[PDB]
Design a protein around this ligand. Sequence first.
Ligand SMILES: *C1O[C@H](CO)[C@@H](O)[C@H](O)[C@H]1NC(C)=O
Ligand SMILES: *[C@@H]1O[C@H](CO)[C@@H](O)[C@H](O)[C@H]1NC(C)=O
Ligand SMILES: [Fe+3]
Ligand SMILES: [Fe+3]
Length: 692
Amino acid sequence: GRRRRSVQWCAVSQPEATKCFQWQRNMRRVRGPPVSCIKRDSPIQCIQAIAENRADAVTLDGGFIYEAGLAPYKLRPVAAEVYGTERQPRTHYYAVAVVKKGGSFQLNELQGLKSCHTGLRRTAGWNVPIGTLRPFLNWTGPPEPIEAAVARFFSASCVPGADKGQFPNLCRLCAGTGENKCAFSSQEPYFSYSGAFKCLRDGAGDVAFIRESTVFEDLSDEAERDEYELLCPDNTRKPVDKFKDCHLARVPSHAVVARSVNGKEDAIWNLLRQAQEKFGKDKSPKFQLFGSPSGQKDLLFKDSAIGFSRVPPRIDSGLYLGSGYFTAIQNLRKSEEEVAARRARVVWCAVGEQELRKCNQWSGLSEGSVTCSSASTTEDCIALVLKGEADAMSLDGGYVYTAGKCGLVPVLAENYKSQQSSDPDPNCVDRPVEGYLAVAVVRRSDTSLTWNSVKGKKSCHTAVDRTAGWNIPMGLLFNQTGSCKFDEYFSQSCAPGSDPRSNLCALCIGDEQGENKCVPNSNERYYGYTGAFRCLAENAGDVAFVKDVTVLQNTDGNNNDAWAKDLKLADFALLCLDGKRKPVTEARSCHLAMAPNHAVVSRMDKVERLKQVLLHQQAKFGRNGSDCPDKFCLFQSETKNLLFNDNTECLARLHGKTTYEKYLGPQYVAGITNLKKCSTSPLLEACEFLRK
Ligand SMILES: *C1O[C@H](CO)[C@@H](O)[C@H](O)[C@H]1NC(C)=O
Ligand SMILES: *[C@@H]1O[C@H](CO)[C@@H](O)[C@H](O)[C@H]1NC(C)=O
Ligand SMILES: [Fe+3]
Ligand SMILES: [Fe+3]
């Protein structure tokens, strides 16, 4: 037969353990998957237990998801709590500031007042309120903890888990008896959402920092809910049911975490899917997964949560938290000077070592304004910008699709020499973009090869998901065949970013030492426009999917690299969609499609600053730049197209095309959306979940 010992759940107190044991027997009784219980005293202790295989799983507030994701622990959210109603379920909630009706004070008039918080380091109880209130605190920055600043700001507080000895003021309102006063557990009555609300009901505090549902969970009579109002960020008060218009932040729901390593994801999800169906929202009078004995609240999971939702594998704690909240958490340990220096600075994302070296030279010359981050794929760079770890990169239109689905926006586009219509152009920055031509290049010798007989031959691609190299040729082919089976369009290929064991990687050669085969960065010698052309010129493939200028740039002594030095434009032809073949110089009547210019993308929070930096930087290191070619040229890398295309004339403005749909256009977006039905990336799955 088989075996599965169990999933080891960490409880953080005794009533938790109690509920965890009674869950255990109800799983055995109903014959479902087994869960066993571990006991600790704190979230941190559960995070520790899990990282050293003494437990599998624990539910955590967003604040502790952040902690859990740091080294040495490296934990990952695997399942989100779902709130709302089965009609309108949601994996987020709202941090609100609740007050009694009858006072005049607003969110900016809180000094000297008394406060009720759920707990130190918690989302709604601490991180959001304290980050919102920051400009009123007169905090000097480290080494003095921000706690000291809030201790002087409110006259008295209950902040469970605060240091009663260092910050006695933060524990003064706490209703705990003895050593239980101000503790991070239910021994302290004013702990967590309901505890903080009770601190307000009792009149112990003037303000409670809680979630939007607390007043509805704890007050059944709707006439008693009227005695309460919300503080809105626009310095007004509004009724408690108007939380959507009146909240301090919208935040990700609590999540079950697990090891990133041998995490047991499947068993945890298997247990949770089963537990939820059998003991969920009023399913069994035997046991309520999301209920707590009338002594207590929120044991193991949030009371009245309605289920779980599985977190896609690509999501780590930072992606889970979102750029806003993730960077806001980090900012609580930083001075306002440091925070404002990071806003001023542009962190570039480099894909691979070669782009990293060039970005490093730019950085040194940028007068503090540009710095560098790096990853081994473009998707990984996109993730770094979502975590606010990097800010910017230039992307092929195919990747702009992915970036946009993830919420990033185009800011400036690569502009290229204008079809015999502009000069060495003073007005490049405002000249609207013209697109580039996607072409199918073949050898002249290959007289019998046409568009019509291209299926089954050997193919060279820039990378998977790029415009000229992938989306256009494969999109045209998909339009005939109907087949999602992309690895059978051609006998063999180099298509970087594909499965190394597939036919799509067969012709890739990897680096100078034969490592990194089929890797979607410049280490693979066949990567990108230049590498897909090379793949053809060295007889690896029979067709290369590139742009017209690529052939021009790599023939007739235009590229003096060993592989390229003796190639002639006349040895190459284009495949036209009408089955004819033409010279490269006739691309205008023999191209597969027009591709949108590569664009620099970023987060919405960086757009204006990014524009100032890039415009200033290109004035110095651009084509007509003051310090180019003397010191450094941004748009030069000897046919390697590092960071930008080498034929970029300038970075230009978008003229209203400020979203990916407007920039790429409705036709191109339809095409890719179609292609993506055949298979989506982890990152796209990840972004779907995060945008819900
Ligand atoms: C912070 O400085 C302001 C002066 O701009 C003052 O109103 C206030 O008393 C100071 N202290 C705190 C903790 O708000
Ligand atoms: C794709 O299919 C056909 C070829 O069968 C092509 O002519 C046409 O452009 C595409 N389909 C439609 C209906 O637009
Ligand atoms: Fe929370
Ligand atoms: Fe491209």
